Design a binder for this molecule. Structure first.
Ligand code: PNV
Ligand code: PNV
Ligand code: PNV
Ligand code: PNV
Lengths: 330, 331, 331, 330
């Protein structure tokens, strides 16, 4: 998948993520309220009490709410994205550390944390562990991005050297490899702009472009994580600033679109389709969650703030996998 | 912009296109009814009479309705797209031809034609002229694609040598250069697949890809016309066979999304921002014309087989330039 | 392979080409003298008589000398290169044409022609036939480039529609597809420059390139014909104006080096290894033909304006397939 | 520049390097014999006594022989290549370390070291220093590759974290960025082979390639260090094994050629040409040095073994910047 944060021009931070998977059963939008318990591991019993309510896209098939992204009531936003062959986990916690499940990292940070630093500290009392949840069958190689209300982003990744933190990132993350590497890849591609190369001659012949779009030459178009990072970064940089929160979601979906993967164009070596099952955006300041799906391109939205925050069970919706065409006449 | 037709499994032809421009003049959905009247030229009063009623996206700022694409009541779909530096027009009609404004051809084909050969034969009595319009300020360099209910597809292209007809096209079209050139560019990319590269060794070091989608390696990703064509064909090829009309409209919007241009990422020589104004799709069997827009990713649909098809007046629907977000709880 | 002509500042035209093949049959430098005799066809005994003597690389395994490229005593340079899937030949000559073996045209142009229009006009009396030879086993799909002492350049291309002449070419040619197609592909790469991209900021992070040569971003690097053409033209464009013949021969070999294929990096459908057998350059004003080879990066030169130009017999020079390393001290 | 080692099939290791610069005055091939002194710094006086004789391309304008590449008599081969914006140097040595000049690293390792491990050890009694030699005007951002007779390669690079060593590399190095990054870039490009993609159809149309060469699609062609690494790596991998030492030099020059830079096609922001001024190859087993230049494509060779190794002054040659065309007739 691919993610990014942007900064509205009326002091408002937004974060969006594409989920790319090989077939998505289930997954609703869950507001999880205060004082629900979120477990830490699955085969053992500790379950931290969340100070904060948050909301996002997740599962509900194991025993604590699993969230892939979300905003909590204090303006911190987050995602776990795949991260194949670079994710490393422990068997048992370290010294003065106790253990956590990759799939649980988000719920737990979003229920407890507010600043982006709060997340770096929280995550040195954690060692990630090699536990296979039943909804997949194994521990998804993951890495996490996060973004507080101020718009400062961070990437946390579980390498084999140990947990790697990157402060003050450019607010973009996709998938493997490490964020360090994508950030230096960016340089190879600085020539990719919105501006036309200027006309040339080859002897007597005059050479001018086929039409508009040529400043972009070099930018790869495949759906490889390295390219996906490249396009999301590069169209974040040049895309026009969003003046308001609605415009933010719109941009965020226009940029993600360049990396949105149709059914069938990417196969695995087993032979299943890898496609964009949904794509969402969240706002720090209003604590809104907006989302879109493969089978429907109408953004649905929940407001976390206008709900019973305090509050016996989780609140649920519930995917409309059907194209919501407005008929202007019958 | 960029286009293509696909065919579903319930025997249904569908054609979609994005429109890329530096600013929107007022456009709308326009239903043109039988016997309305469409000029050939802006400076002349000859007004040929449309046999058929149709529906598409168009302008209304000039004497007759101008359609960028759409579908008449006999299930013929088409569009005009930009075709810069290649498009050539006349000063006067060749002997035994009526002259025509290039912005008027879709209207005129869509009001009087049913099959693809109908359009081929129709443009023998025609000569594209160098006529301006008050909408843009000049005769825009265009070429045309068309797609009848059977699924066949063509490209009419006004070149320096004359009007060039390409028959049994793959049903994808972009902008310049000419259809044969793009059709031969496809060759240089046949190793763009949905499949993964095999693993290799470089000495004792093992190499396997970053995650996925490496079979696509070499597909360009910019928004030049020539890149768009590639994306649009290769992703047309591999995307899943659509099964119904609606899931057909989705596939089209997904395939087109790969070539949807956000504001600011493409600038002009005068630094105008070139972006996808709207995307539309239409169907031959239902005669339904769908569309989203830059600020509204919600699809609106218009049925044409439900209207006063012999109406005296145009039937039009204004743009909803407002992002139409559903509230799942009170927001 | 890949070719091009350049012009120096002491008013000298030079043409170089690489030859890419899956194995070398015996080839050599061949000086063909005036009045030698060159067949049109292998199965026929008509033997037209060469006005001019020339020199180039060729075979000797068939009844007449076969030249892949070279330069006659009137300073006309040329080559035949592969032209797969596009090249079309006859079964019989069109009315009022003598038939010819495609492998024989360079010989026949080089023995009887002086300027580029001479060659254009000459191939109106000609029809490429489908005639095999015992060297390769079949009529190879080819096209031809030519370059006279004035610097002008042309591409003769045997298409399905017929023989296609492109005049005032940029003087670069590769393999397929057709010259117009490559000439229009150049457009999609005009932002391949020797200049650095400007520095940018992405938020607060500063970006500047890895070292150098980033203006080249987007130039493909594979050994498809279409890539080679690009490399060869853009590096023809920017490389430094050569000042003399010899430094002219170097530039050519440098520009060609970018498209020189090492053994094993390109395989065939039957898995034959396709590699650059040799590179040659020749000059119009000196009538000197230069060449290195895969195993000998040392250039050997043959002067033609020093021989028995009316000799009864061929004059030939065997390949030195031995890397010719200088010993600066006793090695 | 760009470099690589290959392994002959008769138990013989060879290493070649392209030198890319913005104008090359001077530079001969220098055999430096045993018991010559090689300084360590330029403004201060320590000068280590070399156990071994070696030979390569270098300068002779400062006060100790500067070598860019070479082989010593014990079969170790080496190069310094540029390394812009990633090279970091100290002002003063560390603890138990004393100081060295980037330009001197090669002479000194090649005069003293035999195994590739010998080089890792030697280089933890060294801290590189910020001293501006007169032939350039400043300390060239450098990084070093090395290769012993056994064919095991290593890359040493001076990062800002400190000196970075990579063991058992793939035997390829160009320029920035770090070797770690190029090695993981390699994966993005595994699809680049010698084999044709197989034919496809688009509806009724048949699609087959323009001709031979299409397995290579994706490989970039620019002269950027990242691409240059990519081509040198990828054509090293697929190029046919060299059966003997002569064939080794030939391959090594056929592979380097793909990354050999013509005059004029690369400019700097000041506006000077950046071109390949020479390109050389060396053998572990025979201790031969072979070289080629921009203006001449005939390989000249020195044999280190057939010289006075022991031995008052340096031995010199001396560039023939003139195309050595054999005339087969006058
Ligand atoms: C005056 C313009 C800014 S608008 C007109 C025209 N159209 C567009 O920009 C619309 O999109 C394109 C789509 C494909 C190729 C070229 C352009 C074009 O080019 N134009 C510009 C130009 O020529 O500078
Ligand atoms: C089990 C799987 C079907 S899913 C897992 C992995 N990931 C995905 O499909 C998710 O999508 C990604 C897309 C790009 C980069 C990383 C991940 C992959 O490859 N996998 C497959 C595999 O080959 O085992
Ligand atoms: C001083 C210089 C002319 S040389 C220095 C640097 N390097 C080179 O020209 C050498 O060539 C390289 C080529 C590729 C990567 C790294 C180096 C560069 O850029 N430079 C120039 C600069 O811009 O200051
Ligand atoms: C029989 C062959 C291996 S040799 C013949 C022919 N030529 C080459 O491989 C020479 O190089 C080329 C140069 C440009 C385009 C195509 C080929 C070709 O293709 N051939 C091969 C084929 O068609 O498989």
């Amino acid at each position: 998948g691919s993610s990014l944060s942007i900064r509205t021009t009326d002091d408002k931070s937004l974060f969006a993520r594409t989920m790319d998977f090989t077939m998505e059963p289930d997954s609703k939008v869950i507001i999880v309220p205060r004082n629900y318990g979120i477990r830490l591991l699955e085969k053992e019993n500790v379950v931290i009490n969340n100070s904060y309510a948050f909301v996002g896209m997740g599962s509900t098939d194991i025993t604590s709410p699993v969230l892939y992204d979300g905003v909590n009531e204090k303006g911190l936003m987050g995602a776990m994205l795949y991260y194949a062959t670079f994710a490393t986990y422990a068997d048992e916690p370290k010294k003065g550390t106790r253990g956590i499940n990759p799939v649980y990292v988000i719920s737990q940070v979003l229920g407890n944390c507010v600043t982006v630093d709060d997340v770096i500290e929280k995550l040195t009392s954690y060692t990630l562990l090699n536990e296979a949840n039943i909804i997949l069958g194994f521990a998804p190689p993951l890495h996490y991005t996060f973004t507080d209300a101020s718009g400062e982003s961070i990437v946390i990744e579980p390498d084999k050297t140990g947990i790697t933190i990157h402060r003050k990132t450019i607010g973009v993350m996709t998938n493997s490899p490490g964020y360090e590497w994508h950030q230096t890849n960016l340089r190879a591609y600085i020539g990719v702009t919105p501006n036309p190369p200027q006309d040339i001659m080859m002897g007597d012949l005059d050479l001018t472009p086929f039409g508009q779009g040529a400043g972009g030459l070099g930018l790869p178009g495949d759906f490889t994580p390295s390219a996906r990072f490249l396009r999301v970064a590069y169209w974040k940089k040049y895309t026009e600033k969003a003046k308001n929160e609605t415009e933010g979601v719109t941009n965020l979906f226009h940029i993600l679109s360049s990396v949105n993967i149709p059914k069938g164009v990417v196969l695995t070596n087993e032979g299943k389709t890898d496609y964009t099952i949904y794509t969402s955006a969240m706002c720090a300041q209003s604590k809104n969650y907006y989302f879109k799906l493969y089978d429907n391109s109408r953004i649905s939205a929940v407001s976390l703030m206008a709900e019973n925050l305090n509050s016996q069970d989780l609140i649920t919706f519930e995917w409309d996998r059907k194209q919501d065409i407005k008929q202007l006449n019958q």
